[PDB]
Amino acid sequence: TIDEGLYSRQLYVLGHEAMKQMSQSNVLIIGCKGLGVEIAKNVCLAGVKSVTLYDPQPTRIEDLSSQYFLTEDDIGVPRAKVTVSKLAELNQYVPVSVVDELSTEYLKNFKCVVVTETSLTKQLEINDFTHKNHIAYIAADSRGLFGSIFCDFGENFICTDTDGNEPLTGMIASITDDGVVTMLEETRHGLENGDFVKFTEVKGMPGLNDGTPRKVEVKGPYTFSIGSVKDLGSAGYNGVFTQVKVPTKISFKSLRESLKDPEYVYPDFGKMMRPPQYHIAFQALSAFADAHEGSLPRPRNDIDAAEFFEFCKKIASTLQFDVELDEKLIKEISYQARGDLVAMSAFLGGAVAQEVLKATTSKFYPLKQYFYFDSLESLPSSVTISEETCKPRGCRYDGQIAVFGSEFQEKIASLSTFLVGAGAIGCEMLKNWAMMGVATGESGHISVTDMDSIEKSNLNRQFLFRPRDVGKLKSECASTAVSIMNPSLTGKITSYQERVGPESEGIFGDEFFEKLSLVTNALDNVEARMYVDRRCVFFEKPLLESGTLGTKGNTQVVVPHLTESYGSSQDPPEKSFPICTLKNFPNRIEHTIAWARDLFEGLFKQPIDNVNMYLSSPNFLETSLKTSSNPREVLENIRDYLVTEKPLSFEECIMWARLQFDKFFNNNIQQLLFNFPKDSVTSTGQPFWSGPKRAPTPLSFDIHNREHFDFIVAAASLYAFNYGLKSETDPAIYERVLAGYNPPPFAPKSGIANKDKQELKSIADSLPPPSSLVGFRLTPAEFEKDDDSNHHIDFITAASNLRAMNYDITPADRFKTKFVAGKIVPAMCTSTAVVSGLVCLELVKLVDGKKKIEEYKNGFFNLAIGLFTFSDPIASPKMKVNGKEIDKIWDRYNLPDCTLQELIDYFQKEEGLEVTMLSSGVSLLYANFQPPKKLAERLPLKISELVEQITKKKLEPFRKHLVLEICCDDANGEDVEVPFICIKL
Amino acid sequence: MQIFVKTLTGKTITLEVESSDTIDNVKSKIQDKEGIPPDQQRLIFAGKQLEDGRTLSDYNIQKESTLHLVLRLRG
Amino acid sequence: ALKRINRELADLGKDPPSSSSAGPVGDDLFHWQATIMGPADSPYAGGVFFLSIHFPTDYPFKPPKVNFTTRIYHPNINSNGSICLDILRDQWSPALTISKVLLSISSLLTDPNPDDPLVPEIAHVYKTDRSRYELSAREWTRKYAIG
Ligand SMILES: Nc1ncnc2c1ncn2[C@@H]1O[C@H](COP(=O)(O)OP(=O)(O)OP(=O)(O)O)[C@@H](O)[C@H]1O
Ligand SMILES: [Mg+2]
Ligand SMILES: [Mg+2]
Structure with missing residues (x-):
């Protein structure tokens, strides 16, 4: 009954049984701010049976800092009532409702309960009931650049798939009577000890075709042992073995029990002493809110910071935590207590939505149990951050200004970005830029290019499009949608329909590329990634690459003169x-x-x-x-x-x-x-x-x-x-x-x-x-x-x-x-949300212009196992040329339009190197092994004329530079690599 | 000493070898008897694939041990 | 890529292969027109075969694409000229020169591999009626590989 015309990409990740079980589960979401609405969007796109929202708090202006389904005409209205109408349109198979009041007994009607923006007493009251009644309970929170997730799926959670990989299958050469099984030539089974496998299409031992699981004893990379097969036969010829996976029982602990004795998940191994700090810090935040009528500490306030640190000390003393508190980190959390960013909200919303799918489908390994995340390295340092600049100004960017300040807001509002592609990652990136206010100043601008058209299967993870939009161009629809989200981007967005490649250089020329500030890739093929990387390298522009595959995802940042290019990756x-x-x-x-x-x-x-x-x-x-x-x-x-x-x-x-x-x-x-x-x-x-x-x-x-x-x-x-x-x-x-x-x-x-x-x-x-x-x-x-x-x-x-x-x-x-x-290619909405969040968290580093290479992070993650890792970018390789330090990637020679002989003489004299090969693209302009007559005929010609003659094609009027690859030998005869030449026509 | 090599088709070849003999010598004997190039012979004993450059004693091969022979064929 | 190709081409220029002569087509460095001379002690004696070589972008980390142009009656070569050899598929390493590939192709011409053929009828004829295979090879290499 699953609509394979809409869930085509999602089924290759989850499966028929997983989605069939998922379409019979009810989800309640308490709190409808940016994180809550993000979770609701991802869940609705996932395909659960229904979604219920509960948030009676009236809307305020600052709530628009991350809520992309709210408009300035909705100020003073509860968020749920104005969000349900817009959420019900994402998927036609997922009804969305709103409940005015929430009684405890009502919680028995649902399969999963997500809790955000709720005080600790209410969390305890809800959990004390949702634990003993076997209801999944997920609680998320996002404060500034810090985030916390807590999962509790009961004491008898049954997990069917524990890693998300397909069962290991292989072709058998033969099986002896001693249970020794060998694969075909140069084939690795990849199994481990204790696994269970079943055999099919085995000749000579029909009994093994039944499928009863048997123990596996790995005797080597190409052979293993299964036991004794004396009764069924003596030797088995050919056949196929398939791994059998056994369910695992995971027993969670309730919130009240896990407050005292938490179980942590470390998202990075370079800083593993912080999560114990955040566990105290969040409880201190809840206590402080309860002690001041639900008002969080003011941004960059010293008095509130001191009171917050006193509360932290009190909690640490009460809970008998033998941990030395870090004053700096705690006060930093205090400063950003009222912050609300869209990148953190998107990242945590994706994570929590994946957790909801895990809870409903009983698939993949969930978080156990606390997950504390921080991107404090993103805090700008080249601008002034203080109490005066971070104060709210009564605008929709208060949730971001309270973290970054007005000067960084001005820096953001004057960006001129360039997004290549308008896929799922493109849609999420455009949403994040619209929410952050990117290119809302006088000098800002946005350009997005994509040549494909919307199809039915794309509506499962591209939330800016609708069924009525099937058949239209992606870029136009995306630009219109994001203009609707943020009216200030009206006329500040340009949407092209051109394929980025060698033939589009007439539109994306030097004039276009010299005004940009950064380029973000949302492509899906290696050729276009390489081409865009080469162009960015030529023009020296920061680049943001990001890729997804099912539940895996990675994000990379390329900085001019600092890190290596995408090519080598x-x-x-x-x-x-x-x-x-x-x-x-x-x-x-x-x-x-x-x-x-x-x-x-x-x-x-x-x-x-x-x-x-x-x-x-x-x-x-x-x-x-x-x-x-x-x-x-x-x-x-x-x-x-x-x-x-x-x-x-x-x-x-x-x-x-x-x-x-x-x-x-x-x-x-x-x-x-x-x-x-x-x-x-x-x-x-x-x-x-x-x-x-x-x-x-x-x-x-x-x-x-x-x-x-x-x-x-x-x-x-x-x-x-x-x-x-x-x-x-x-x-x-x-x-x-x-x-x-x-x-x-x-x-x-x-x-x-x-x-x-x-x-x-x-x-x-x-x-x-x-x-x-x-x-x-x-x-x-x-x-x-x-x-x-x-x-x-x-x-x-x-x-x-x-x-x-x-x-x-x-x-x-x-x-x-x-x-x-x-x-x-299998794809998911949660992976897209996570990669968009990581890319936008790197974008604020790029804007601030951080110079050190230890301040950037390339990210990788796998949501089938809850794995997150971050590693510093690789520095650009250096080299010695004529006794000078030269960057292998980010260096070039600038020369006028001179004759070939003059170029050779210049390289012989200025660089002390002899030119032995000179090519322009895929054409061999000059070589040292060519006959003398041809060289003498080619030497007195200018570079442009030589290129036109050799390539049999006139140079276009818009051409303004030539990239020449030169191989030259030193005086001793040793080959030395040199950067390319940028001839200026 | 003597050893037995079983092929993929159920045939058993008896060989006279010494514990110190190299794997290369055994592959040479198998090529002499069956005509299979050594490069394509994959000999396995006790769940471990015999590698060139070593001796039988390295793999704890003793009196009347049994090996298995398979052929790696290119496309 | 380009630097590796230029190094190989310069090495080929210094040492004339005599039996082989490879060079770029026109001025394109990613398309070569190689020439192979039939071995003397082979049915293809006195024949000139032209091959097209296309280098991949990630060369030498990827094997080049080699296609025959002159029609040849060989078990491991079909009418389209596609070649059935290992070094071009799996054994390829970033260490083999194009001269090595040409020598390997010449050796393949010297003795086919009917055990794992690409054109089953030719291999069957080779295994059953050797003399007929020789006659057919001589006829084809005279009709197509000459002139
Ligand atoms: N060379 C290119 N220049 C510009 N846009 C490109 C280029 N190559 C791909 N794209 C765009 O990248 C996007 C690819 O995103 P995505 O793979 O999610 O969508 P899709 O290809 O339509 O879907 P699916 O992969 O499920 O068939 C498409 O918008 C495509 O137009
Ligand atoms: Mg498409
Ligand atoms: Mg695609």
Whole structure:
């Protein structure tokens, strides 16, 4: 019942069972400030059964510092009543309600309870009931640059998946009678001792196919031991082993019990003495609020700080904590007590939403139990922060001014950022910038570029779009939405529709890039990341990279002249398969899926293109005869798709589909078996079809079978779409037409003047002339995974399953086929929120212009296990050039537009280096091994003229610089690396 | 001494070796008897894969030990 | 990338391979047109084969793409010229020069590997009727690899 057209990306992270159990749980959220609304948004996007809000406090202006669903026309109204209407629109399957008053017994109606902005007495009263009644209780708080999370899921929490990784699977070479199991060649099982596994498709030991779990004894990286298998058999040949995961019982402690004896989680191992401080500090904050009518300490107040420190001392004495309090850190928490930032709110909201999903679905390992986080390193130091500058000014930025001050507010309001891409991370970044007031001054500006369009599956994690917006451009909708969120950004946002690449340099030129302040990437492909990184390096602009994958996420910051570039942080490459394995000898479902995709392309895409080009290019045949690798293939395809096998109705499409079935699943396998019989042996006497090669078996077309019928339907539908006919789905027509079918006789063949040319000419003169068919064009089939009615994924699934049946491989359903064929990247809304929070926390460091490299942090996290880590950026490598210190990345040579000979003389004299190679992009301008005549012809030419002549392309009018890569040798002959040259045209 | 090497197809080859013999010598014997290049021989004993450059004694191989032979084939 | 390619090209220039001659196409450093001469003691004797080499961006951390252009009747080479060799797929390391790849391809021409073929019919003919395979190879290398 799960709408796979909307939760397509989320299911690959959670699963069908997880979401099915999640859609039957009720969540109550107490408190509806920035953190509360963020949690509610993430939960609603997640897909819980319902959400209930409870916050009777009337709205105030400062509450807009982080609440993005509030407007200045709502001042004086309870936040819940004005937020429910806007929240109910995020997802149509998640009702949202509001309760006027909250009685304790009412709490029995819910499955999870989230508590924010609530005093300690109320937290204790709620927890004393939600603990013994087995209701999940999550309490979150965000004070300035500090945050706290507490989780309590009862005393008998059952966790099914403990790490979020798929079960370990592997292919078995053979199993002895002693229980020794070995994988295939150079294959690591990766198992540990004590695990449970099950065996399937094991030959010689059918008993092991039942699936009963067995102990695992790891004897090495490639072998392990399972015990004694004497009774079931003596030796097992081939088969597949799959790991079995056992549930874990976790017993939590109530809040009242865990106040005295807390259990901490350390988000960073470089500072592990702080969380004991924060545990005292937050309780002191609650006590101080209770002692002054709920009024937090004033910002940067010394009297309130002293009273707060006295309260901290009192609490430490009362709770018998043998910890030496840190006066500086406690007073810092006191100063920022009334702070409310949007980056911290977004980060903690993402974390708490993930915790709610863990509590509801009984999946992943939750926090146990306290999680105290701080980003105090983000506090600016180049501006004046004091009690006078941090006082509220009666504006919507008070929640931020109370932490950063008015001078830093002015610095923020004059930023000119550039966001590349408008995906989920782009939407979150735009929300954060709108809330922070980025580029709201006279000199501020924002530019966002993205060339994609909104799809239905994107609405699950991109909250700035709506179902009515499907089909429109992302950048325009995002700009309009964020202008609605913050009216001050009206006319301060520019949205482009251009793909960032080499061809867009005419728009994102030097004039555009010299006015920016920072660039933030929200891309999803490595090529664009590398290109943007190179451009930023050339222009020396700070860069913010961020990536997500399911529940994992990472954020990196690049600072000019200080840290290394994104290039060197390149990830390991991807996986591709040899042509030999795909063509003839597959052994996994991925191989069959790739083969099915190639078959689809070669059946419904390439012949159509050839026919269309023949009917468009006047001289196509002659060029293809002497250019195409297989002109005979092209001519035969044209003939078949024009005259020989042109369908006239749907019955002929069914006949053609049956013929293709026989041609691809029955005749090729017979030919392959004829070439390599099942009893054949290698040159060494070893059997051929052994190990990584599986003996295929021809398929006989059984109409009653489901897979055959699916393949026939899919092929007929695609052929009709290619010829623009009308397809049908009733089985009656298929059964009727395929009943009277006579398979043409087929036998394997051993093989054994200008006849070939005369054959080609005979094919050619049979083709109808191009003039006879004018305006007749065939529609190619462009692959589209997201559409469920285009018969693409159905065809791929059918072909993959049939080929798996050929080679005795386990077939896969449509879910796995769609995941593999489309290269879908799993994604989550919580990961997006967390990465956006981290990036925006680094942005305030970038604005302040911190110089030391120890003040920046690259972040990594994995929410499936509650892991967070932060490490300093890597410094840019240095080098010695002519006895001088040179940065390898952030240095360049600036030279005028001089002749090549003058450039060589300058490098020989000024730098004392001999130029041996000079290139501009992918063109070799000059080399020391070229013949003297060519050099003498090229030496007296200017650089621009030389480039134009070599590249056979005139320089564009907007071009203003040339980046030259030069390899030069020293006087002794030792190669020395030098930075690139920036020729100024 | 004598040892037995079992292949993936259930065959048992008997070899006359010494505890001090190197793995290279055993792979050479297996190539001489079955014609499998040493580079493609993966010999396993007691859950540990024998590596070139060492001796049988290094792996605690004693009288009438049993090894398993598999073949690593490229694409 | 570019620096590594230039180093390899300069090394090739200094030492003439005699049996091989590789060079960039036009002035593009990421597209070479290599030449291989058929071995004397092989069915492809007296033949010139032209190969297209495309270097990846992360070269030499990634193997180059090598495709035949002259039609050849070989078990491990299909009609499209795709080559079935290990050093180009997994054994690739940031230490092998293009000269090593050309020498390896010449050796592959010297003796095919029918045990793990790419064109099953050619391998079957090779294993069953060697003389017919030799005749076919001579006919093809005379029709396509000459002129
Ligand atoms: N070279 C590029 N220049 C500009 N924008 C780009 C470039 N490459 C990708 N993008 C944008 O990056 C965003 C990718 O985000 P995301 O992957 O979440 O969305 P999607 O690709 O539409 O979805 P899915 O990955 O689920 O199919 C898209 O807006 C795409 O337009
Ligand atoms: Mg898209
Ligand atoms: Mg994408």
